[PDB]
Write a protein that binds this ligand. Structure first.
Ligand code: JCZ
Ligand code: JCZ
Lengths: 210, 204
């Protein structure tokens, strides 16, 4: 039973993932993903969501008054507020598992040079707030990160070393045969072979994990 | 000038991409023949594996020897900002999006005999397929295309006082040197707290 609210100035970005949800989970009321246009909470006829940064610098900062009103309406005491940012704590599988048991996630998607820091700081005085990064690269905004987090979390909600290579038919293709051990019927040996493949791949690609 | 082709069994998922660059999305099922792209794994295991035959045909049509073939996978080399800068100079990226339990390894191995191949992970979490990773890679790369360390500290804008929370006074002081020093300090503090690995310290 999880509800996810996403707030963004580009609601159309999230539309595919909304549609991608299985009806059986939606009908069972096990999951609901709602997307909100941040501009619903703007104060002015120009629907302004950003303003110049204090202390100077490039780009713009999203307005605290707008975000404050949005979160006031959408969040409750039980909300886990997720704020994607390149400066965040790392979002990992452990994080995804933890958040998969939450009743209400709100994902605040920033743009430009991010959201006025007081928004998160204020919210943290009455709900749990998690500023997170999905990887060491910079995006244009939080929307792609939201898609990633939603996918990684929801697939752990029941109802909705590195892995080595996998193979399927045909046994020979473009001069390459499936490793004979996999067709050996020696399942103890197959397990040992897969372990070694995983070890070698981890050494080559992710020595940090060792 | 960059071309990006994405191959997927779920082309509709890639609508979120909304003259220096063209992005094209191809339905993998276009290269099937009889009225299945997946089969059970050799050696056992849960789930299904995408057959190499259909992928080979698709990539034969879409790739050239100059192509950088990108294959999202949880077991990939890390995709980082450095990678994004590197790929931002490429003429042609092809992103092969897996589903099920992944793609038969021979697809990448075969392709690597004709072109450069990069199996990459966008982070240490598991997705349902390569499509979300493709969106992340495309965004991170295209923003670096010509014509298109430490953690950043907090940013602020008007009003200077909000809900009884004040913008740090130094930011209103107009003293460029003091502001630079404060921002550097905030960045160091944030990096130590959130990403100590970036400064060569142990992770929590
Ligand atoms: N891991 C990661 C997060 C982001 C991100 C998140 C929000 C915003 C808002 C403006 N730029 C942003 C970038 N980039 N990379
Ligand atoms: N970094 C990361 C990549 C993926 C990914 C990529 C392709 C497939 C195909 C089936 N599941 C997949 C997962 N998850 N997390």
């Amino acid at each position: 039973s999880m509800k996810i609210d996403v707030v963004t100035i580009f609601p159309e970005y999230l539309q595919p993932v909304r549609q991608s949800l299985p009806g059986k989970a939606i009908d069972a009321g096990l999951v609901d993903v709602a997307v909100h246009d941040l501009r619903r909470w703007t104060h002015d006829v120009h629907k302004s969501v950003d303003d110049s940064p204090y202390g100077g610098g490039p780009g713009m900062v999203m307005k605290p008054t707008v975000w404050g009103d949005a979160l006031d309406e959408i969040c409750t005491s039980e909300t886990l507020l997720v704020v994607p940012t390149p400066a965040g704590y790392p979002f990992t599988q452990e994080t995804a598992w933890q958040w998969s048991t939450e009743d209400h996630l709100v994902i605040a998607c920033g743009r430009y040079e991010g959201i006025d820091q007081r928004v998160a700081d204020d919210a943290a005085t009455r709900m749990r707030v998690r500023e997170v990064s999905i990887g060491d690269y910079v995006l244009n905004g939080g929307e792609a990160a939201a898609l990633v987090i939603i996918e990684a979390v929801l697939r752990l909600v029941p109802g909705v070393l590195l892995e080595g290579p996998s193979y399927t038919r045909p046994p020979s293709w473009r001069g390459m045969d499936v490793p004979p051990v996999l067709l050996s019927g020696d399942h103890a040996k197959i397990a040992a072979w897969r372990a070694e493949q995983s070890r070698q791949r981890t050494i080559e690609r992710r020595p940090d994990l060792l």
